[PDB]
Design a protein around this ligand. Structure first.
Ligand SMILES: Nc1ncnc2c1ncn2[C@@H]1O[C@H](COP(=O)(O)OP(=O)(O)O)[C@@H](O)[C@H]1O
Ligand SMILES: [Mg+2]
Length: 376
């Protein structure tokens, strides 16, 4: 039996076909998605998933995240250079010119780090199916070259998986939205995720998809929404407590966690409270953080990032030679497309109501599970 795995830059997701209905699998922590973050403790253990995410700010050296921008890429790649400036961990040049990483002295490869994620994903799949997980359908971005796709297949095979097929993420979401059975239509895939923004235009002819154009920003994702709110929260805390949280890593780690949760609640509620009891220790006394945040306050803080996804979408329509009246349906991928203002931009960008049929942070994995059941 074969599982579908979305190996995302920020969060990964595993799914397996259960008859004619797809099934997203919950990991050991009960989450339906696993953070694509690997860390090595000072004790020496290796942390994968949420146990590693809750430590990124406190232990920034021995924590690897967003390594998907490094996989299948040489050290002299522009994308590796830009990503090298935006990380606290060591990004080293491999012997063969590729880009590797180092933690506690020992070196690791992007395929090796990606395998650590896939180990827990297969461990999640095993805990369901029972026995062992041998076959797997893994997804990649449409813009991945040949060297990147082989490095992704490396990561699956290092974890012990047999990568049957390697489909594209925008094609995977199309299978999750059931457009596999349509006749003919031109589709736009709006993928705003944790670390990358991807806009893809797909054409379906008699049941076969075709990638017309590809654009977006690979450094524009949900992580930037988190940091903007974090920077705002820390500022309104120096104006109320006179303390800059940047000096307490544990405090900051708490803040990032609380900031993202605030953004997630604001997608279905217009107001939420951030209560961090006993955050920092001052000379005067233990300080606290109680903050009321509205959806309108947040939309204005991150309106710059939402607008920055608009130009790559229009450039994709001229490279695809399509217009607003040619695109038959728009589907949303990535958990960030749950933000109602991001949904409003998509509606004001293609003239149609965006399809909110599949969980955007689960659509890629569901589509890979569609491919798995067919290869069985
Ligand atoms: N309900 C939600 N509302 C707003 N933002 C969300 C919600 N769920 C997840 N997010 C954000 O979207 C991102 C999820 O990305 P994900 O679906 O894992 O795509 P990928 O990891 O493949 O890039 C995370 O950064 C998270 O902060
Ligand atoms: Mg994604």
């Amino acid at each position: 039996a074969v599982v579908g795995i979305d190996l995302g830059t920020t969060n990964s997701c595993v799914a397996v076909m259960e008859g004619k209905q797809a099934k997203v699998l919950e990991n050991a922590e009960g989450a339906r998605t696993t953070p694509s973050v690997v860390a090595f403790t000072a004790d020496g253990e290796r942390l994968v998933g949420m146990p590693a995410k809750r430590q990124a700010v406190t232990n920034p050296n021995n924590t690897f995240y967003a390594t998907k921008r490094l996989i299948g890429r040489r050290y002299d790649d522009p994308e590796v250079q830009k990503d090298i400036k935006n990380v606290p961990f060591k990004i080293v040049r491999a012997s063969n010119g590729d880009a590797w990483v180092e933690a506690h002295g020992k070196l690791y490869s992007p395929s090796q780090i990606g395998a650590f994620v896939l180990m827990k994903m297969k461990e999640t799949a095993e805990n369901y199916l029972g026995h062992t997980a041998k076959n797997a359908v893994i997804t990649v971005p449409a813009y991945f070259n040949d060297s990147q796709r082989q490095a992704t297949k490396d990561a699956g095979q290092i974890s012990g998986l047999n990568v049957l097929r390697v489909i594209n993420e925008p094609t995977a979401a199309a299978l999750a939205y059931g457009l596999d059975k349509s006749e003919d239509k031109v589709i736009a895939v709006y993928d705003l995720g944790g670390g990358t923004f991807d806009i893809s235009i797909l054409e379906i002819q008699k049941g076969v998809f075709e990638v017309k154009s590809t654009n977006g920003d690979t450094f524009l994702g949900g992580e930037d929404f988190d940091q903007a709110l974090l920077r705002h929260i820390v500022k309104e805390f120096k104006r109320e407590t006179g303390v800059d949280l940047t000096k307490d890593n544990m405090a900051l780690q708490r803040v990032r966690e609380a900031a993202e949760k605030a953004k997630c609640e604001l997608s279905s509620s217009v107001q939420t409270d951030i209560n961090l009891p006993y955050l920092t220790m001052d000379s005067s006394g233990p300080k606290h953080l109680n903050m009321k945040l509205t959806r309108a306050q947040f939309e204005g803080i991150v309106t710059d990032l939402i607008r920055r996804t608009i130009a790559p979408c229009q450039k994709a329509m001229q490279d695809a030679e399509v217009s607003k009246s040619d695109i038959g349906e728009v589907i949303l991928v990535g958990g960030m497309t749950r933000m109602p203002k991001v949904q409003q931009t998509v509606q004001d960008l293609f003239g149609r109501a965006p399809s909110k049929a599949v969980n955007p942070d689960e659509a890629v994995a569901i589509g890979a599970a569609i491919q798995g059941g067919v290869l069985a």
